[PDB]
Each structure stands twice: as structure tokens, then as C-alpha cells.
Amino acid sequence: HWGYGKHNGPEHWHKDFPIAKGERQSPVDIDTHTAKYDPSLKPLSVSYDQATSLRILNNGHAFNVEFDDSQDKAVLKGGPLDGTYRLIQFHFHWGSLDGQGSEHTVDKKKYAAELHLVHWNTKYGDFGKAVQQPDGLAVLGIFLKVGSAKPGLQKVVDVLDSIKTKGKSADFTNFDPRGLLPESLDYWTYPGSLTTPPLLECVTWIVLKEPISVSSEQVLKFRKLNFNGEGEPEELMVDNWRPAQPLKNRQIKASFK
Secondary structure, eight states, rough: OSSTTTSSTTTTTTTTTGGGGGSSSSSEOOTTTTSSEOEEEEEEEEEEEOOEEEEEEESSSSEEEEESSSSSEEEEEEEESSOOOEEEEEEEEEEETTTTOOOSSEEBOOEEOOOEEEEGGGGGSSHHHTSSSSTSEEEEEEEEEOOOOOGHHHHHHHHHHGOOOOEEEEEEOOOOGGGOSOOOOOOEEEEOSSSEEEEEEEEEEESSSOOOOEOHHHHHHHHTTTTTTSSSSOOBBOOOOOOOOOOSSSSOOOOOO
């Protein structure tokens, strides 16, 4: 099955998921000089005060922090979006080295990691329905650089030893995702896709301009995770990122001049 190795990595995915070569694939390089300021784009509204985190899961590709999405508790609105998008999970993509790991790039620059806060459009009723719609998902992408520690990330880092291998989960209640946001909500936006199979073209991407900083120790703990299940040969969970895909007939818009 698909993964990030030589024999099952991003260059192979098209054989099972032909949309991999589609018209609105993600991630992309964000060419900052060619993105256009769109003065009509609204400020984002990130309403996470009532968020209810539930669990953290190593799914063999990344780790997901899952939320209760059966009510409007943590929602994203505004910006390029029409309607209300509920937070379902967040996860990260990261590298084996500090100079790679992000999925999106900025003027070809790779960050050490990238956080995806995944939300679905409540007009479609459930996540599984939403991924079948061109405006089904809104993903807030946040770059990570290595520097000072991010205090709001530490509770996530703390629990990773409990979910080392594929299929392990742990209770993860009362986590506040507001602690993962940068100061500014300035963003780029474009229509794209899931960055993992099934690669469905259902995402409005909202990529924040300002990265967060995390420490060397925090990222090193991400890199101790395993792609494998317990009792299988150890393969470190690193370099779980898809490279930039062709922009094709898309324009990236900026919320800021």
C-alpha cells in the first residue's frame, strides 16, 4: 500500500489514485511575487474556544489529534469560505532534517514541518460526504521552523511515546489548538486537494504566512515515531510529506499586501 518509501512513495500514488495527476492537486509552491492580493478576501475567523479534543492516533502515516465534530465547537469561517467549517483533526508532516518536511513551499523554501488543521463544511453533514465536494474541506496550513520551543505544542510532544507505532491511540482531551497558531492570520489561499491518498480535490487551502517556531527537541520527538506497527521492523516516521505539484490553471490569492 501507499506510503513515503522508494517503492510506495508519492511518485507511485497515481497508479492507485489517478487523480494524483489531476487539475487541482496539493501541495504547491507558493510563489510570493505572483500571488495576488485580493482586497475582497475577508479576515479569517478561527473560533476554537469551545474545542473538544478526544484522542491522538498514530495511523501509520502521521499522528492525528481528533476532535468532537458533532456540534459547532471549533469552527473556521470567513476568508475565502462561504459557510461554517468544523475542525475534525489536526496532524503534521515533517522531515528527517530541519531543511525539509513541509508540503507547501514558499518561493521553493521548505520548512521543517507543516501543521494541517482539517475542517469540513457543515452543509454536507459529515466528513465522508464533504470530501466528495469541491468545497467540502478547508485546511489551515501552518509552517513550522526550528528555533524557540512552542509551549502549546508540548502536550502533543509529551504523549508521542504512548503512540509510537501504527494503530496505537491515546486519550487526548482538553487540548487547546489555539496554542498552535502564530500571531498573524495573514494567508494565501487556493483550491486544491488532500495531500495523501485518496488525493480528493475537495480542499480550500488557507496557508498562513507566519510560521510557528518549535524547538529542536520538539521536532526530534516527532522523528522518533514509527511508520510500522508494534512487533514489525522499525522504520522511523520521517519525511512524510508530498512534494509540490503543478499549479496548472490556478491562481494563489493573498489576504495581505
